[PDB]
Amino acid sequence: AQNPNCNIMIFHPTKEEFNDFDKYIAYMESQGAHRAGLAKIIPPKEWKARETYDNISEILIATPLQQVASGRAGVFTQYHKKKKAMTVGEYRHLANSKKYQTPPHQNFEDLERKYWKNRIYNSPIYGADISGSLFDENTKQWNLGHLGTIQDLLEKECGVVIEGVNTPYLYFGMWKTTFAWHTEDMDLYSINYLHLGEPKTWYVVPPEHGQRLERLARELFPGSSRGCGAFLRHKVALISPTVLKENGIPFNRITQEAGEFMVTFPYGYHAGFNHGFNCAEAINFATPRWIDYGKMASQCSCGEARVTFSMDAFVRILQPERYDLWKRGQD
Numbered sequence: 001a002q003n004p005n006c007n008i009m010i011f012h013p014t015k016e017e018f019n020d021f022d023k024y025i026a027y028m029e030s031q032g033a034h035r036a037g038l039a040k041i042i043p044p045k046e047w048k049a050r051e052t053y054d055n056i057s058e059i060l061i062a063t064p065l066q067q068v069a070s071g072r073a074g075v076f077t078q079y080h081k082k083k084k085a086m087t088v089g090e091y092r093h094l095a096n097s098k099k100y101q102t103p104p105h106q107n108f109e110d111l112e113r114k115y116w117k118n119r120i121y122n123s124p125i126y127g128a129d130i131s132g133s134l135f136d137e138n139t140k141q142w143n144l145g146h147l148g149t150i151q152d153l154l155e156k157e158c159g160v161v162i163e164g165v166n167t168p169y170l171y172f173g174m175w176k177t178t179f180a181w182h183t184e185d186m187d188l189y190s191i192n193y194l195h196l197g198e199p200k201t202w203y204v205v206p207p208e209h210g211q212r213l214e215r216l217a218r219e220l221f222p223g224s225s226r227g228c229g230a231f232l233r234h235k236v237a238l239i240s241p242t243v244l245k246e247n248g249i250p251f252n253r254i255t256q257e258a259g260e261f262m263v264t265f266p267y268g269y270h271a272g273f274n275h276g277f278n279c280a281e282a283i284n285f286a287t288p289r290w291i292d293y294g295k296m297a298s299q300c301s302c303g304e305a306r307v308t309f310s311m312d313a314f315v316r317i318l319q320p321e322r323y324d325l326w327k328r329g330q331d
C-alpha cells in the first residue's frame with residue numbers, strides 16, 4: 001500500500017504531465033497521495049495562471065465577513081458577521097492596516113505559534129465564496145474554470161443526466177482569516193490555487209481517520225453536536241494542532257505559497273489560516289473514485305449548512321433515502 005503513514009505529498013509535474021488534469025490526479029493517487037487527505041502540486045516553471053495581477057483592484061467583495069471567535073485559544077467557534085461591500089483594492093488596504101496586518105515574525109513556525117495563541121482575540125475580515133475566476137482564458141493547463149464538471153462525471157459514471165453547474169470561487173484573505181474544520185460538500189475533492197500574496201497554512205486529517213476527528217469534535221462542541229449529527233458541515237469549529245496531538249488525532253500540516261495548488265481528497269477534513277493579504281481560487285471536482293464517498297457523505301438537515309443549488313441533484317441521486325430530510329433543511 002502506497003503512503004501508509006498518510007503523509008502529505010508534494011508533486012512537481014512537468015509541462016507535459018500538466019496537460020491532462022484527470023490523468024495527473026489518478027497518478028497522484030497511484031502514489032498514495034489521497035491517503036493524506038491533501039496534496040501540494042507545484043506547477044512546471046513554464047506555466048502561469050495569467051500575465052499579471054496588476055488589474056484586480058476593482059473586483060467587488062459584496063459581503064465581506066468578519067470572523068468573530070468564541071471559546072478558548074485552541075478550541076473555538078467562529079461566526080460570520082456581514083460587513084459593507086468593498087473593492088479588492090479597499091480590502092487590500094484594510095488587510096495592510098495596522099489593525100489587521102501580519103505581525104513581525106521569524107518564520108512560518110513562529111507565525112503559526114502566534115496564530116494559535118492570539119487568533120481568538122481578533123476578528124479578521126474575509127472575502128469568501130465570490131463566484132469568478134482569475135485564470136486567463138488562454139491558460140489551458142490546470143485552469144480551474146475549465147475543468148470537467150461534477151454533473152458530467154456523475155453522468156459518465158452512472159448514466160444519469162442532472163441539472164446543475166460547477167464554477168470556481170475567489171477568496172480574499174488577510175492575517176488570521178480562518179477556515180474551519182470541514183470536508184467538502186458531498187465529500188467531493190477540492191482544488192485551490194493561491195494566486196497571489198501571503199501564504200495559507202493547512203491542517204488535514206487522513207480520510208481513513210476522519211471519524212476520529214468527528215468524535216473529538218462531538219466531545220469538544222457538545223451543544224452543537226446535540227443540535228446536529230453533522231455539525232462540522234456548518235463550518236464553524238476550530239481545534240488547534242496542540243489539542244489534536246493531546247487527543248491522539250492523526251493529522252498533518254503544510255504551508256501553501258503563492259503559485260502553488262493544493263488538492264483535497266474525498267472525506268479529508270481540513271482547516272487552516274492565512275498569513276496576510278492573499279487571493280485564492282478554488283472549486284470542487286469529482287473523479288470515478290469519489291462516487292462511493294458521495295454515496296456515504298453525511299449530511300446536515302438542521303438548517304444551518306445551506307448550500308448551492310447543484311447539491312440537490314447529488315443528494316437526490318446518490319442518497320435518495322436522505323433526500324426528503326435534507327431538502328427540508330434546505331427549506
Ligand SMILES: O=C(O)CNC(=O)C(=O)O
Nearest residue numbers: 171179190192264280282
Ligand atoms: O481559500 C479557502 O480558504 C478555502 N479552501 C478550502 O477549504 C478548500 O479549497 O478546500
Ligand SMILES: [Mg+2]
Nearest residue numbers: 056057058059
Ligand atoms: Mg479589477
Ligand code: NI
Nearest residue numbers: 183184190270
Ligand atoms: Ni475545503
Ligand SMILES: [Zn+2]
Nearest residue numbers: 228300302304
Ligand atoms: Zn446542521
